[PDB]
């Protein structure tokens, strides 16, 4: 009976650092990603698959940047089964290539937590005690098919000291919450792509070390870039072991990196030696993670009016006009918002402290 009378005339009106604690010095991270039907949903544009894989490549890059001696494993769970998409290794380029290839995957079926976790545990069952065993799982669908009991696998993982972290997309799942809590991991829910990136960045940093974690004196070798010149009569090329297991022609270079333990030749670093198991690293790789050992504390934010000192930034001489000026804790210098954000995020050291 809305037809009695109606006019739009009235419409027409004028008008997070923790304590100084032990961390994951060596990490063996396995990433399991759902390949179910729900991966085609539009929770994140364009779909879960594309955004997830792009952020996964970014996560791999950042994780290898901050964890030189770590490893990454990629497993895709679809159709109630798991596929070991990528082996656990330290090559960033290979993992990025695999993720780009999997961008065109077929999202079908349902995730299988039991199978994926069993495969990951079997892979990590023989890992050394000192190396941390951490697993990250991205859960799209709320339903999982279990060919056996799941809680027994949880007990086995807890006995194996394997950490499990879950970042879902839809909402909270009781089983995932229990798995994250019991094994010591963290369970998170994605609000958007920005929150997805934040969670991935938080998972990039080494986790705090467990009490039961061992502290062993591991032996590592540091070979140099021994390059053989044809001007020398001892310029004998040899195919690199990493390149040898390749479809194309392996790199037949005159020199490179030779293992100090078994004289194995590798053209890429940091790579653990295949033959003798020696962890072949470089000195910058070790120093690359020292900022974790020595985190930079947050600076004191003081309003410009209440800051009765200098009006220029110490790091860029910028004429400070912002309402917030950040003062260092140690040398108490003057830094603008940009410098305060960048130094803590990237530089990790205050120049005045060095001075």
């Amino acid at each position: 009976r809305w037809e009695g009378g109606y006019e739009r005339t009235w419409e027409i009106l004028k008008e997070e650092h923790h304590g100084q604690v032990r961390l994951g010095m060596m990490r063996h991270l396995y990433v399991v990603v759902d390949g179910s039907r729900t991966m085609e949903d539009q929770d994140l544009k364009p779909n879960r698959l594309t955004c997830t894989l792009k952020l996964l490549e970014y996560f791999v890059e950042e994780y290898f940047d901050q964890n030189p001696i770590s490893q990454i494993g990629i497993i895709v769970t679809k159709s109630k089964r798991a596929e070991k998409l990528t082996e656990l290794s330290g090559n960033p380029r290979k993992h990025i290539t695999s993720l780009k290839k999997a961008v065109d995957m077929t999202c079908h079926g349902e995730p299988s937590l039991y199978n994926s976790l069993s495969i990951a545990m079997q892979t990590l069952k023989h890992m050394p005690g000192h190396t941390s065993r951490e697993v990250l799982i991205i859960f799209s669908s709320l339903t999982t098919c279990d060919p056996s009991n799941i809680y027994d696998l949880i007990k086995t993982l807890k006995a194996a000291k394997i950490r499990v972290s879950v970042i879902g997309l839809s909402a909270e799942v009781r089983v995932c919450t229990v798995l994250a809590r019991e094994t010591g991991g963290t369970y998170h829910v994605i609000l958007d792509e920005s929150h997805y990136k934040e969670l991935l960045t938080h998972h990039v940093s080494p986790p705090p070390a467990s009490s039961s974690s061992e502290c062993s004196l591991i032996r590592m070798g540091f070979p140099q870039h021994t390059i053989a010149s044809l001007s020398d009569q001892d310029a004998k090329p040899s195919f690199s072991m990493a390149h040898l297991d390749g479809n194309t022609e392996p790199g037949l270079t005159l020199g490179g990196y030779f293992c100090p333990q078994c004289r194995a030749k590798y053209c890429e670093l940091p790579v653990e030696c295949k033959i003798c198991g020696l962890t072949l690293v470089s000195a910058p790789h070790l120093a690359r993670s020292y900022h974790h050992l020595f985190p930079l504390d947050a600076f004191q934010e003081i309003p410009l009016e209440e800051y009765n000192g200098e009006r220029f930034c110490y790091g860029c001489q910028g004429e400070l006009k912002d309402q917030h000026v950040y003062v260092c804790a140690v040398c108490q210098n003057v830094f603008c918002v940009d410098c305060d954000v960048f130094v803590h995020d990237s530089l990790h050291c205050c120049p005045g402290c060095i001075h």
Binding site: R22, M25, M26, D65, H130, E214, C215, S216, L217, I218, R219, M220, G221, F222, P223, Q224, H225, I227, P260, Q261, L278, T279, S282, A283, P284, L286, A287, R288, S289, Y290, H291, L293, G315, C316, Q317, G318, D338, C339, F342, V343, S346, L347, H348, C349, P351, G352, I354, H355
Partner: protein, 261 residues
């Protein structure tokens, strides 16, 4: 849209230049300053979009330095000369600190580059590179902080070019190897400018077609903290990453016993 920034860090240690002046050699600090200014003028000459940043590395602090001649070039040279004379004239040695604040100057340069990039509009991409001239001896304690700089540049993909004058620095060699910048020691100091122009002046894309001397060999040996000797294979601590030549039950640094049953 190609904005090339060539930040130049000058080793302005008064002690090394005083030693050189007493030697009465052909090359002095004035020639170094003139060569740096000429190189910066040429860099600004090569394109309008190019930008120049000059910071002097001194023990007391790191100084942001910046008639028939170009107006902007003349003004910039006047400002640089004024700042360097103000710093050196007031440079009073108060303390035994001899090693120059190399790491601090690099950090300030990185902060300046970041600020410029933030000020740079999205319409243009600002390629950035840093050229550093090494005159005095290298520093030891800065090493770790120096490393914090290197990856930071590699974080933003910024080339770091080293120009050793007298004292070689393996740290600079490794930084150039990592960031991809060019490392080369000048054989004849009076010929410095041509080395700057012929090698360090062209940009990497220009360097791509150019033929340049091959990079120097770089070693990555380690020091065994209990003796700091060269070591091939060592025992790495899983707690604080301290390296030892022989097996130890307790780490000296982390003070955590190695729980090996």
């Amino acid at each position: 849209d190609e904005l090339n920034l060539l930040v130049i860090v000058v080793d302005a240690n008064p002690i090394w230049w005083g030693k050189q002046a007493l030697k009465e050699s052909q090359f002095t600090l004035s020639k170094c300053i003139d060569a740096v200014m000429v190189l910066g003028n040429s860099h600004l000459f090569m394109n309008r979009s190019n930008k120049l940043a000059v910071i002097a590395s001194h023990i007391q602090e790191s100084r942001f330095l910046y008639d028939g001649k170009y107006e902007l070039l003349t003004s910039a040279n006047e400002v640089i000369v004024e700042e360097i004379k103000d710093l050196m004239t007031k440079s009073d040695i108060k303390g035994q600190h001899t090693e120059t604040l190399l790491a601090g100057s690099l950090a300030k340069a990185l902060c300046y580059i970041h600020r410029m990039n933030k000020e740079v509009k999205d319409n243009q991409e600002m390629k950035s590179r840093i050229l550093v001239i090494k005159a005095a001896e290298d520093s030891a304690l800065q090493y770790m902080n120096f490393m914090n700089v290197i990856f930071a540049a590699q974080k933003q993909n910024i080339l770091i070019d080293a120009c050793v004058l007298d004292s070689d620095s393996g740290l600079l060699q490794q930084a150039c190897d990592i960031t991809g910048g060019l490392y080369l020691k000048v054989p004849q100091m009076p010929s410095l400018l041509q080395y700057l122009l012929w090698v360090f002046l062209p940009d990497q894309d220009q360097r791509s077609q150019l033929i340049l001397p091959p990079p120097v060999h770089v070693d990555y040996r380690a020091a065994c903290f209990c003796h700091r000797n060269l070591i091939e294979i060592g025992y790495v601590c899983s707690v604080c990453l301290s390296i030892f030549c022989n097996f130890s039950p307790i780490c000296t640094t982390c003070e955590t016993a190695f729980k090996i049953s």
